[PDB]
Symmetry: C3
Subunit: 145 residues, 3 copies
């Protein structure tokens, strides 16, 4: 996956960012069975005042998570994952759930590239990693915490 996490400038310290990325990644691997290192968390910070809710300028406490996934998972599984991300990001970022928005977009695996490689179908990550070249797998493996 690629999770675009849209937050206000400095609402998450370097270390808060690490735990938010940790929670998003662990929720993904735990619920989909995809390797930790396939989860990309991409923080987009902006100055406070760039978020408007119903036309009202907002402070620095809103969080939008835009997830980009492969097609192939069920509406049930996707709802569990969206609810776990709301839950865990809440505890990692110490933010009320009322502040958290989470959208999942889906694309065919055949038009999705991670680490310069095309992704397999959901659940086939096992064989697909074994097929990767030896220093491809190595580079991916250096991104697990």
């Amino acid at each position: 996956p690629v999770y675009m996490v849209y937050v206000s400038q400095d609402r998450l310290t370097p270390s808060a960012k690490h735990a938010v990325a940790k929670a998003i990644t662990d929720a993904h691997r735990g619920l989909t069975g995809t390797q930790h290192f396939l989860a990309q968390v991409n923080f987009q910070e902006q100055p406070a005042g760039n978020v408007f809710l119903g036309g009202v300028q907002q402070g620095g406490d809103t969080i939008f998570v835009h997830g980009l996934h492969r097609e192939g998972r069920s509406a049930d599984l996707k709802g569990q994952l969206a609810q776990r991300i709301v839950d865990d990001v809440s505890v990692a970022a110490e933010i009320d759930r009322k502040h958290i928005w989470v959208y999942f977009g889906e694309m065919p695996a055949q038009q999705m590239v991670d680490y310069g490689r095309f992704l397999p179908q959901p659940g086939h990550e096992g064989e697909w990693f074994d097929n990767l070249s030896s220093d491809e797998r190595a580079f991916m493996e250096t991104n697990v915490d």
Copy 2:
């Protein structure tokens, strides 16, 4: 909805931002019947020179709106809304129409969390909101402009 609005830094004053967010929110509500507080407008500012049309670096005079919606509206209605967003943003931001791009993506409502809550199907929003907890109805109700 979530409207990602991509503009160059310093292009939009704090009130010009207020006008654009208000022009986008009013369009969406006036055409979908979705409550004001459900319209998030998320200004993503970048230094001018970061936008390339046809390989040619641009100044600060381009706006790109990316709207994220539930599925279930007609192509006819989506055309009207996007055309309204183009026109009303032209006025609100004092920019010629030929510089605005507007894209809409749609997802199943079952994988779309606003305010920590999954969304109803389009048109059922008065009843979904009446059933939410009153702590939260109250929280959203302050986001009306």
Copy 3:
């Protein structure tokens, strides 16, 4: 199309940004027949350390390319296009392929607006340009490099 390119601050000099933006524009133009002026590259810079892979904080080397296309192109052409974006962004940005992620999202042309105008199907581009006014045509012809 709109190509959202997420990079870390100061990874790309102006010359390198121009070259990345050019590699993406001519890959698209090349494999689709879409005019040079119709391709937007939108650069999104974030401080180094804002990208996490498997919860591991990254340097300035990741690059995420999010392409927003209209529907109707074949899975074969989209893969070719992503693979070429990988290859030519690797070269233009002097960064190896395993740092490059490339996703394509698709939308009905009828909810997509370039230069203030709705786009046609992919199999109607030349007709579409020969249907715009003189001011439009001449103002898009300014965006060729």
